């Protein structure tokens, strides 16, 4: 969960390589998108849209084995100075779009690194961020210019718990090399099923393999398979996705003066061509 | 007077006459500009390039920070550098469109195959500008681009390595690399491009534009 | 009209030029004022104004400090290096890639000789040439875009 | 690092140029020559 | 990101023709 | 877009008109 990134990697969700720590546990891979305007003026509220698409009509394995829908979460790194817009400055139509999203900073201070979710996949297939652009005029250490935004969006249950132990939304290889004899199936009355399995004969051999319910087996009895080969098929239908983009904290005077200069240029060009036209005449009169 | 002053000594008039005696034939359309736009792009590079040499610091400890200084605290630094960036890409592009006009106009054929050859050389030089400038901010992108291309030449047998060590200042990318790339970008390549631009244009003034289609 | 002067085909000097394919700046509209002094500035100012406009609307970014221990995931050369880069990464024998790269300039040099056989400028009157050009152009654009895809999905451009 | 605007710009100009170039060869391949060659 | 590329391509391509036609028209209205 | 289009038209428009405007203005006070 977004809040496990903070727990295991407190300082930042992003490694020097650009890879986000989510991937460290959500081992699958699905597309992720960000949308911000190309430019924003200083001190303005604008929309920043995260997209986490997936097949809505498809469920995944729950911890015990059920088959529930799946949820989405995300981390969104905006530029220094940027922050979630104050509620009273979010106009209504936007407020409707955003929803009951509990934007929470990665750590105290990092108000531009926002964590989001668990949120219900069905409706938060895309996620609006009302964000407020900083102002170089009242924060002398925030400058105009073009900055990066990094996204790290997920959907579906992870594969490793902050403790280290695997979850059940992945496949369970095989403990040893050789011949198997018995596919049992416990169920201690609290912790559900455990399709137990052993492998033997080769070097003496007797060793066991407990495997949590949720996946499907595509194994059958008596096989002679190797040490670490797929005996469990793959349950995961979620997976993690990244996306980077750029936004321009634009000073309007840069634009206004540029437009001026452009006009001056079109004007000079005119005068030049007209001048040629005058000369094109004189030249006929020779 | 003056025309007289200069005419008496230097023969300014003959100069005026070579200019006012070249004519442009009907077949020369707008694409015959691409060469001059490619040049205009470069002059822009020379101006803004030179300007940035007054603040940029070619040291692994200093380079990146000097770039953010030019962006943030230098007067119009953001503009000057944004121009250098854009106009760098525009030069390469206009050069390509220029090569298109040449080829789809047969203007590279006898007696102009040296203009074409010096042109190819110009294109290699320009790409060299781009590659070296790319690495000067000594940021993540620029640094890993160098770390990748610099190794390419090691496949070449006999020399390969030696070539690579030569244009990176040793084994591995580091300060020596940045130092050498800075020399390249702001001293070697500007002189080379100037020579071969000189030859390009001289041969052109001598032979005039290619014929009609 | 514009303003025009016809080839003085009675000038043996101009004829001896034209003969070696080379008298074409002797006739047409006069370059001085007309072109050099009136429209050249329009092209220069125009070229400058477009770049300035782009520079202001989409200014240069500053990336992260280079880290010699941390390879970026995203890591491309500039656009005009895409094709060569596609070639370089997607050809497993390194010396073959280097050679294929050098072949681009070296090859391009040979062209005027290779195509010196006939004397045609117009691309329609040299169909073989114009074809190999368009083919090469296409393969270039293709390779360039391919640089932009993941390596496995690179050559198929993700369609087959 | 990639910058589409530049890429889209490159493409539109490459195809517009290649186009206009063939258009000009054609327009001349076809009411060609005059005034002497 | 990708919407930018298409905008840029369409416009760089097509606006050429707008300026072209505009030039040709300016010519028509001056007479030659 | 739609607002971009409108502005664009109008921007060119003013200028085309300043051109045409200025030939004649200039022309029929005999200057071209």
């Amino acid at each position: 969960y977004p809040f496990w990134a903070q727990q295991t990697y407190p300082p930042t969700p992003r490694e020097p390589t650009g890879r986000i720590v989510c991937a460290n546990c959500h081992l699958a891979a699905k597309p992720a998108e960000v949308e911000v305007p190309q430019s924003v003026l200083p001190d303005t509220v604008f929309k920043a849209v995260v997209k986490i698409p997936y097949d809505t009509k498809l469920q995944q394995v729950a911890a015990d084995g059920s088959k529930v829908g799946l949820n989405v979460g995300a981390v969104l790194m905006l530029p220094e100075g940027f922050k979630i817009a104050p509620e009273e400055r979010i106009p209504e139509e936007l407020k409707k779009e955003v929803g009951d999203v509990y934007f929470q900073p990665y750590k105290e201070g990092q108000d531009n690194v926002l964590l989001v979710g668990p949120l219900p996949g069905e409706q938060y297939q895309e996620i609006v961020f009302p964000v407020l652009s900083p102002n170089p005029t009242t924060d002398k250490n925030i400058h105009f210019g073009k900055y990066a935004i990094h996204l790290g969006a997920n959907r579906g249950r992870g594969q490793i718990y902050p403790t280290g132990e695997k979850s059940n939304n992945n496949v369970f290889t095989a403990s040893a090399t050789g011949t198997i004899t018995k596919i049992a199936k416990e169920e201690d009355e609290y912790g559900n099923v455990k399709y137990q399995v052993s492998i033997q004969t080769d070097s003496g051999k007797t060793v066991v393999d407990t495997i949590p319910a949720g996946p499907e087996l595509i194994v059958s009895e008596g096989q002679a398979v190797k040490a670490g080969e797929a005996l469990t098929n793959n349950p995961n239908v979620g997976g993690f996705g990244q996306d980077d983009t750029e936004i321009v904290l634009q000073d309007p005077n840069r634009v206004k003066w540029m437009i001026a200069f452009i006009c001056l240029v079109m004007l000079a060009q005119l005068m030049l061509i007209l001048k040629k036209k005058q000369v094109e005449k004189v030249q006929a009169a020779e | 007077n003056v025309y007289d002053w200069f005419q008496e000594r230097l023969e300014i008039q003959a100069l005026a006459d070579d200019v006012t005696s070249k004519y442009v034939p009907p077949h020369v359309n707008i694409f015959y500009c691409l060469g001059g736009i490619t040049l205009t792009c470069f002059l822009i590079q020379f101006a803004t390039g030179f300007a940035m040499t007054f603040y940029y610091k070619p040291t692994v400890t200093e380079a990146y920070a000097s770039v953010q200084y030019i962006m943030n605290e230098v007067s119009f630094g953001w503009l000057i550098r944004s121009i250098h960036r854009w106009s760098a890409s525009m030069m390469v592009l206009m050069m390509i469109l220029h090569v298109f006009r040449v080829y789809l106009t047969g203007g590279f054929k006898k007696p102009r195959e040296l203009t074409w050859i010096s042109g190819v050389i110009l294109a290699v030089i320009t790409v060299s500008f781009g590659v070296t400038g790319y690495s000067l901010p000594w940021d993540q992108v620029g640094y890993w681009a160098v770390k990748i291309v610099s190794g390419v030449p090691e496949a070449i047998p006999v020399v390969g390595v030696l070539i690579s060590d030569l244009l990176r200042g040793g084994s591995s990318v580091g300060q020596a690399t940045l130092t050498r790339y800075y020399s390249a970008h702001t001293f070697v390549l500007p002189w080379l491009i100037a020579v071969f631009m000189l030859l390009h244009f001289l041969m052109i003034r001598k032979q005039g534009i290619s014929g009609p289609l | 009209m514009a303003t025009l002067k016809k080839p003085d085909l009675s000038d043996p000097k101009l004829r001896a030029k034209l003969a070696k394919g080379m008298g074409h700046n002797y006739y047409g509209e006069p370059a001085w004022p007309n072109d050099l002094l009136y429209v050249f500035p329009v092209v220069i100012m125009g070229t400058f104004a477009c770049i300035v406009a782009l520079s202001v609307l989409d200014p240069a970014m500053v990336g992260e400090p280079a880290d010699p221990f941390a390879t970026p995931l995203e890591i491309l050369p500039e656009w005009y290096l895409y094709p060569v880069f596609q070639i370089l990464r997607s050809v497993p024998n390194k010396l073959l890639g280097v050679l294929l790269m050098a072949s681009v300039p070296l090859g391009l040099i040979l062209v005027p000789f290779i195509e010196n056989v006939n004397k045609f400028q117009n691309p329609f009157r040299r169909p073989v040439a114009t074809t190999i050009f368009l083919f090469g152009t296409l393969v270039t654009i293709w390779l360039g875009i391919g640089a932009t895809f993941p390596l496995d999905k690179t050559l198929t451009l993700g369609l087959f | 690092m990639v910058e589409p605007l530049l890429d889209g710009l490159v493409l539109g100009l490459v195809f517009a140029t290649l186009g206009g170039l063939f258009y000009a060869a054609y327009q001349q391949y076809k009411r060609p020559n005059e005034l002497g060659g | 990101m990708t919407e930018e590329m298409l905008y840029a391509a369409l416009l760089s391509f097509g606006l050429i023709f707008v300026g072209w036609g505009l030039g040709v028209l300016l010519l028509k209205i001056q007479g030659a | 877009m739609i607002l971009g289009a409108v502005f664009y038209i109008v921007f060119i428009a003013l200028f085309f008109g300043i051109a045409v405007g200025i030939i004649f203005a200039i022309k029929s006070i005999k200057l071209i």
């Binding site: 634009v255 | 359309n29 707008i30 | 429209v39 609307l57 | 327009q27 | - | -």
Partner: peptide, 29 residues
């Protein structure tokens, strides 16, 4: 948030107007 739009537009306008002035000036292709 649409001085921004005039901004981009002005780019498109000099791009267009330059080509226009070239063609016009040299009666051009």
């Amino acid at each position: 948030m649409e001085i921004d739009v005039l901004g981009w537009v002005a780019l498109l306008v000099v791009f267009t107007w330059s080509i226009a002035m070239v063609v016009w000036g040299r009666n051009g292709l």
